[model samples]
Target: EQTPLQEALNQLMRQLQRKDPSAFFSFPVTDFIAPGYSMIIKHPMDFSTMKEKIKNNDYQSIEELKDNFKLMCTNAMIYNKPETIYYKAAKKLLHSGMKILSQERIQSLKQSIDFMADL
Candidate 1:
């Protein structure tokens, strides 16, 4: 069985895919004005390897997995625009997913609100 945290992350990913089909490539408003443009690209972080590890009950890579979640949360916070309803909904889903994961992985998912504060 997948952990509640994993399930929530999966749901959030699906919501993001729907909300921003080009989310991986689109830069946020903040990034637009930088003197040195850093392309905000989203590439699929293949979770199949992680999933296999989870299925094997291996927790060795849990930290790394949590980091990926953190990155996704960060991306969500940065990319969520207020002008569109879809963006708002996607942001809400991302926030909710972060909460669920934090509760499930209480010790490691400690970097909460850093992204939100930056937003």
Candidate 2:
């Protein structure tokens, strides 16, 4: 049976397919609106796992994962609207994640940001 979260994921997938194929596949920041509250994940597997964890009410892991994912997505917004309030918010969230997560985990997320920036 499809959970509510799974249904939401399915809807998102269908919306992406109808709206932006490249973004649906690559999970780019361009997939979301600027200054929006949405988060994007590059890897589909990670995306699915994150959603699953949330649906399962795994708060601790979800919070940590959300922190990292938000930072990465916000970093992507930097290239588009560097001086905007949204960019600043993203930076703040990134800093918060850095403080909360271990150095190694933070570094991994930073690496993901750098990789996304290059793409």
Candidate 3:
């Protein structure tokens, strides 16, 4: 059984994930691929991990989910140079994801719950 918050977050997560057509932020960055990624990035976060967290109901609030999302983007920017594709993709994903989870969208989601509760 999931709460309304969980459902709303899942919807937002899906929207944010879909923005990355190239799927760059789809998975975790393995050390084999990035070489010592775990060392530099102490707190690593990715879409798959976020999905798992959502499944387990680990996120207490939407802001917590957004924190993880931002961490994923910042981690990529830190690991890759500004000239690299990965860096550019992360930057773009961050911008678009923010739009999808904007203030208006949040208010809409809140209003949705209010109406559904019949109050």
Model 3 scores a TM of 0.90
Pick by TM-score: which candidate is best?
A: 3
Worst 10 residues of 2 by lDDT: 16-25
- What is candidate 2's local distance difference test score? 0.45
CA lDDT, every prediction? 0.46, 0.45, 0.89
Candidate 1 local lDDT, 1-119, one digit each (tens)? 77544553454445434444435323333344432324553632223433444555554443455565455445545545567553565566456645544545544333332343356
* Model 2 Cα lDDT, one tens digit per residue, 8-119: 3344334323322233213434434533424533432223444455466553432355454554545555444788654565555445544445466545655554576678
Q: What is the lDDT of residue 75 in candidate 3?
A: 94
**Candidate 1 error regions (>4 Å):** 1-38, 42-59, 103-119
TM-score against native, each model: 0.36, 0.33, 0.90
Native-to-model Cα distance after best TM-score fit, residue 1 in candidate 3, in Å: 2.8
Model 3: lDDT of residue 111? 78
- Per-candidate RMSD, Å: 11.5, 14.7, 1.5
